[PDB]
Amino acid sequence: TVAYIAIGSNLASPLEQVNAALKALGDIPESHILTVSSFYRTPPLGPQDQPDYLNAAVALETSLAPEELLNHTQRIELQQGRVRKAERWGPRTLDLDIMLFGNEVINTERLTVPAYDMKNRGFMLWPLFEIAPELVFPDGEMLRQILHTRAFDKLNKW
Numbered sequence: 485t486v487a488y489i490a491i492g493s494n495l496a497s498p499l500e501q502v503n504a505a506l507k508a509l510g511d512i513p514e515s516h517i518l519t520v521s522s523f524y525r526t527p528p529l530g531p532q533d534q535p536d537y538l539n540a541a542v543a544l545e546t547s548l549a550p551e552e553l554l555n556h557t558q559r560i561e562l563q564q565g566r567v568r569k570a571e572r573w574g575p576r577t578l579d580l581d582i583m584l585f586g587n588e589v590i591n592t593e594r595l596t597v598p599a600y601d602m603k604n605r606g607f608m609l610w611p612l613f614e615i616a617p618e619l620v621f622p623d624g625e626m627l628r629q630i631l632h633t634r635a636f637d638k639l640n641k642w
């Protein structure tokens with residue numbers, strides 16, 4: 485299955501964090517990286533008292549079940565010093581969000597796929613479009629068309 489994973493970081497040297505995350509993602513069992521996006525510098529969504537983010541996206545081929553993939557992405561966040569604050573949308577060393585897990589629709593307590601807010605976020609859609617321009621969502625929408633409709637600002641390279 486092709487999983488598309490969003491990467492974000494705005495603490496503790498985001499470029500190093502993203503590079504470390506990519507290495508670690510490739511080391512996940514029964515999985516391998518297919519494609520990686522460019523790195524983008526994006527202003528924070530949410531509270532404005534935090535640094536700009538490095539955002540990227542990666543396509544990962546995996547034979548893991550989705551929740552087992554989640555266990556592994558969460559482990560990588562923790563290995564990279566992720567600390568979860570009280571405030572929503574606050575800063576973090578590393579954030580790995582499963583945007584899509586093949587064409588699956590998943591609704592559980594731990595996991596919602598497609599990622600619940602991705603269609604509203606240029607910092608998720610643009611890096612995804614760079615690596616999967618032909619992508620169609622489980623609901624039948626084309627990524628290319630969602631981008632056309634929303635006309636989100638284009639991103640700047642990190």
Ligand SMILES: Nc1ncnc2c1ncn2[C@@H]1O[C@H](COP(=O)(O)CP(=O)(O)OP(=O)(O)O)[C@@H](O)[C@H]1O
Nearest residue numbers: 568579580581582583593594595596597598599601
């Ligand atoms: N598709 C998905 N990818 C990753 N985590 C997901 C997820 N769907 C649900 N979750 C859940 O989201 C919980 C909180 O994850 P956090 O990383 O702290 C939220 P965040 O990514 O900072 O904000 P955001 O979801 O608004 O982007 C996790 O413990 C996980 O169970």
Ligand SMILES: Nc1nc2c(c(=O)[nH]1)N=C(CO)CN2
Nearest residue numbers: 492526527528529537573607
């Ligand atoms: N620019 C940007 N802003 C955010 C991001 C993110 O990845 N990029 N993620 C958030 C919660 O996960 C908080 N707001």
Ligand SMILES: [Cl-]
Nearest residue numbers: 598621622623
């Ligand atoms: Cl969808």
Ligand SMILES: [Mg+2]
Nearest residue numbers: 579580581582
């Ligand atoms: Mg997250």
Ligand SMILES: [Mg+2]
Nearest residue numbers: 492579580581
């Ligand atoms: Mg997130």
